[PDB]
Write a protein that binds this ligand. Sequence first.
Ligand SMILES: O=C(N1CCc2sccc2C1)n1ccnc1
Length: 125
Amino acid sequence: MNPPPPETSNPNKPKRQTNQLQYLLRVVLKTLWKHQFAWPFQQPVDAVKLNLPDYYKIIKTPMDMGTIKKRLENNYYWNAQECIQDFNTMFTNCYIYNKPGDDIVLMAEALEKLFLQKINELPTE
Ligand SMILES: O=C(N1CCc2sccc2C1)n1ccnc1
């Protein structure tokens, strides 16, 4: 059974657009999305479809790139650090649910390295 997906809008949360957040969408997220290993991360984990009934028994703060992309598109975040934390949550969830050497974990490790390379330097506000 699947929980509701994370929110992509929140009317009482203040919005912001910064050069860093624009770069996270146009360059970082959009580049990661094209990678051959990105597909497991492009939407919320479907535990009903994937026959993973214990996924949400274990992962209590779900995150995926589809949600991040919609958040960035909505100006949901106040700053880049908030968005970067949602990427880190997404990678960490994969490491928590799975074990070292698992195919899904190799995909996450490669994306995380690419992610870090791209966020090492961000634009200046
Ligand atoms: O175990 C899987 N997971 C497990 C954990 C995570 S975290 C982000 C995407 C996924 C997908 N599979 C297995 C087949 N496709 C995804």
